Design a protein around this nucleic acid. Structure first.
Ligand SMILES: [Zn+2]
Length: 835
DNA sequence: GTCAGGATACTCCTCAATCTACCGGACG
DNA sequence: CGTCCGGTAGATTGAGGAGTATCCTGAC
């Protein structure tokens, strides 16, 4: 039974049609459990009929002990390699395996399943000892080189001119193997050998960049195109050579470069696309197709489908962006008006590699997954919004009942496992390994699910299964420690690195095994461990850092980057910026500490001088997580923005006194001068006669001005912002303290007294007012605050503790305030200090 | 019958940022 | 019973770079 479509597809090779029509029963007898798709795939090739005949003749012998080839392997060899490859495999069963070559049957299948794989097999047989002995090449590397179309030519060219690149050009064997491990690797290798000095000297290209260009399929064309078009794109189009290298470092990079040259003016002057966006679109595999599709479909997808150009760029910035864009154009109304998906969900689904497949699979499987399995559409969208999401969706549809029934997993656990790149592999690995891990090693299903949730969870699960009996016995590690190490992105690498490096780190550098486990329990923990091993003596000896400080720096997600940045920037920050090593270590000991350190180095002079941000304030701002965005936002709001916005941004730094004396009132001016002098003395900074005269001039010149004394000493002056309290934003509460004379003092919630940290009313506006009255000896005051929830119970009860003996503070909430609970208050209240 | 170049899809590993979730100490 | 408070630890959320894999077309 053959489908008419199958016959139409197979009609490419009429001899295969005759062979299938005549001896199909023999085909299925020699190859049991062979699907029709495999048969039509094998037959339709250039030698389908003869390959099928040879497979029928040989499959009775190729299943022998030397190879034990599966039916699928035989079908793949016959479909890809051809009849010649099958005959060569049959004729050299004894020579390939169990020989000095020492090739496993999988390697033989991988080598032979290529166009002209018989020649590759013959060449690898003839040259394996030569490259393994003289050139010192691993058999894995030789197999990888020979497992490509035209692998014989690449292997011969490597054997001929590996030393020429190793000595006369300084190219390591790994780089040459990477260059020659692609289709037509002989051409790329010869092109590198001919053009490396020219590109490195005349065009100023690093050999790493040239190798990166050539390490792709058809890299000779990319190299020649870079040589020809570097000046044109660098000068006439204003493109950085690194951008050109990034464009040309993909498969078909010559096409991308030519398309960029031809379409940059059009996309930049007729569609409003920035050159950075064009470069981002073209910096992916098949970028010429993506650029042409964007040029054709931007008006259609923007005017009609209501998609912003940024969404179209994000969709088109992936591999196969043409397919994703066409699929979005075709299926946006279908997926929106029928399946209920919002357009942003469709864009999120389509914004990955193979987004067309994900979109089609979502369209096909959303009712099935939502109705038969009870999955929420948000869960299906979350599964699909990943690389290879079609495979994950199909695997979920196949394995949800068995995983939720046999192993007792909940559907939420399965969805969490499958919501990552390669979630199909993780799901299959879980379904295969959970009984083994749980019954033998004692792991609980929750631990297995936690291990398998992250990216590459199949590798982590296999590594855990292989290494737990070794790590937990030889190195004395608790199974919880092993699970914690493995439950991270790239946890296989961290597990192997720990197994290799725990003894040397625990005897030479003296680190505790707990410290090693803490270092290795983060993303990229292998790199952090290697960096610790390399840099611990250097940092501890030259820079005077204790091992605990280095461990604290490295125990983060970017520990390697933070350690390298500390090594680079400790002296320059210490001597040219006046920062103690403790502050540098505190900045570096956070997620993304490299960015924080670089931002501190960049912005310390401007913040400390132009704005007067005491270095301690900058260090405290950067010492928290997200130091780079916080510093950037503070600098941006300081350089330009509403005066009120800068006012709050500089209240939130702490230690600043805002005063808004009213009228001229010379007595009132002297009182304000006394208050600002007292605050400056408390901060240990003397304003001196010039600043005192300037501030009197400012107060006597502009009515309604507000003064702001920074702890550094700078007196910010805002001529006019507001005479009324700003609207409550829900996070920061503002207050104004009014004395008898009339001067107003601005207060902001938070940044409470460090001495009274144990009090539950620290940082509150009423507490701050009471503390100010106590320090400045003010008998009577009224504080108006803007919080609509009213004064909390803490300040209701504990305010009188801070007020001086025989004082009075009147708290006033806004008129429209409503109490948020029973303990709060909602009216003006007078507090008298006690003894 | 091989060899080369291009397009597309899937899987794995680092890095950076933000988001919860508790935890702590004194007064009517 | 009451945080306009911070600190610590853990968990998502997102992006980017790299590796692996297959298939199709064109040319001798
Ligand atoms: Zn309060």
């Amino acid at each position: 039974g053959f489908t008419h479509a199958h016959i139409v597809a197979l009609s490419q090779h009429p001899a295969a049609l005759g062979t299938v029509a005549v001896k199909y029963q023999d085909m299925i007898a020699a190859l049991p459990e062979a699907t029709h798709e495999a048969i039509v795939g094998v037959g339709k090739q250039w030698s389908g009929a003869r390959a099928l005949e040879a497979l029928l003749t040989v499959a009775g012998e190729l299943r022998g002990p030397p190879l034990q080839l599966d039916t699928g392997q035989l079908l793949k060899i016959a479909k890809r390699g051809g009849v010649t490859a099958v005959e060569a495999v049959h004729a050299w069963r004894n020579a390939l395996t169990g020989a000095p070559l020492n090739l496993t049957p999988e390697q033989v299948v991988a080598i032979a399943s290529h166009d002209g794989g018989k020649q590759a097999l013959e060449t690898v047989q003839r040259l394996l000892p030569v490259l393994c002995q003289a050139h010192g090449l691993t058999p894995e590397q030789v197999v990888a080189i020979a497992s490509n179309i035209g692998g014989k030519q690449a292997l011969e060219t490597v054997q001929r001119l590996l030393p020429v690149l190793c000595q006369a050009h300084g190219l390591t064997p790994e780089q040459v193997v990477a260059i020659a491990s692609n289709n037509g690797g002989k051409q790329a290798l010869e092109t590198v050998q001919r053009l490396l000095p020219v590109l490195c000297q005349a065009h100023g290209l690093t050999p790493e960049q040239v190798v990166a260009i050539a390490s792709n399929n058809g890299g000779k064309q990319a190299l020649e195109t870079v040589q020809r078009l570097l000046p044109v794109l660098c000068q006439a189009h204003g493109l950085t050579p690194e951008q050109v290298v990034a464009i040309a470092s993909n498969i078909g990079g010559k096409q991308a470069l030519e398309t960029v040259q031809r379409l940059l003016p059009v996309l930049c002057q007729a569609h409003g696309l920035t050159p950075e966006q064009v470069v981002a679109i073209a910096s992916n595999g098949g970028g010429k197709q993506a650029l042409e599709t964007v040029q054709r479909l931007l008006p259609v997808l923007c005017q009609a489908h209501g998609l912003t150009p940024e969404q179209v760029v994000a969709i088109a910035s992936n591999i196969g962006g043409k397919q994703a864009l066409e699929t979005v154009q075709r299926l946006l109304p279908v997926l929106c008006q029928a399946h209920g998906l919002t357009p942003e969900q469709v864009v999120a689904i389509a914004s990955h590699d193979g987004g067309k497949q994900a979109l089609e699979t979502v369209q096909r499987l959303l009712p099935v997954l939502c109705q038969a399995h009870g999955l929420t559409p948000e869960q299906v969208v979350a599964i699909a919004s990943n690389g290879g999401g079609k495979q994950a969706l199909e695997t979920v549809q196949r394995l949800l009942p068995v995983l939720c029934q046999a192993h007792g997993l909940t559907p939420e656990q399965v969805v969490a496992i499958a919501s990552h790149d390669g979630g199909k592999q993780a799901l299959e690995t879980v379904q295969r390994l959970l009984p083994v891990l749980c019954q033998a090693h004692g792991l609980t299903p929750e631990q297995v699910v936690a291990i398998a949730s992250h990216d590459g969870g199949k590798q982590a699960l296999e590594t855990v299964q292989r290494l737990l009996p070794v790590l937990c016995q030889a190195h004395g590690l608790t199974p919880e420690q092993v699970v914690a190490i493995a439950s991270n992105g790239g946890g296989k690498q961290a597990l192997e690195t720990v197994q290799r490096l725990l003894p040397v780190l625990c005897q030479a550098h003296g680190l505790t095994p707990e410290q090693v486990v803490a270092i290795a329990s983060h993303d990229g923990g292998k790199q952090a461990l290697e960096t610790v091993q390399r840099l611990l003596p250097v940092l501890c000896q030259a820079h005077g850092l204790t091992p605990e400080q280095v461990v604290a720096i490295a125990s983060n997600i970017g520990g390697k980057q933070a350690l390298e940045t500390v090594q680079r920037l400790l002296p320059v920050l210490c001597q040219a910026h006046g920062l103690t090593p403790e502050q540098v270590v505190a900045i570096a000991s956070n997620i993304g500490g490299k960015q924080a350190l670089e931002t501190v180095q960049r912005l310390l002079p401007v913040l400390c001088q132009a704005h007067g941000l005491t270095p301690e304030q900058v260090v405290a701002i950067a010492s928290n997580g997200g130091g780079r965005p916080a510093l950037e936002a503070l600098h941006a709001v300081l350089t330009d923005g509403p005066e009120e916005a800068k006012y709050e941004a500089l209240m939130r730094l702490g230690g600043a006194l805002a005063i808004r004396i009213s009228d001229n009132s010379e007595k009132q001016i002297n009182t304000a001068i006394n208050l600002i002098k007292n605050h400056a003395k408390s901060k240990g900074v003397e304003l001196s006669e010039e600043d005192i005269k300037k501030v009197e001039k400012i107060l006597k010149e502009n009515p309604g001005v507000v003064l702001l004394l920074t702890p550094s000493g700078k007196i910010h002056v805002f001529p006019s912002i507001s005479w009324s309290l700003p609207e409550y934003d829900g996070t920061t509460t503002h207050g104004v303290l009014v004395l008898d004379d009339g001067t107003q003092i601005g207060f902001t919630s938070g940044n409470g007294d460090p001495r009274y940290t144990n009090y539950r009313n620290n940082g509150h506006v009423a507490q701050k007012s009471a503390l100010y009255m106590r320090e400045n000896n003010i008998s009577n005051a009224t504080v108006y605050h803007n919080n609509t929830n009213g004064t909390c119970g803490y300040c209701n009860t504990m305010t009188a503790t801070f007020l001086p003996e025989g004082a009075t503070l009147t708290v006033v909430p806004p008129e429209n305030a409503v109490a948020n609970n029973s303990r709060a208050i909602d009216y003006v209240k007078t507090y008298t200090g006690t003894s």
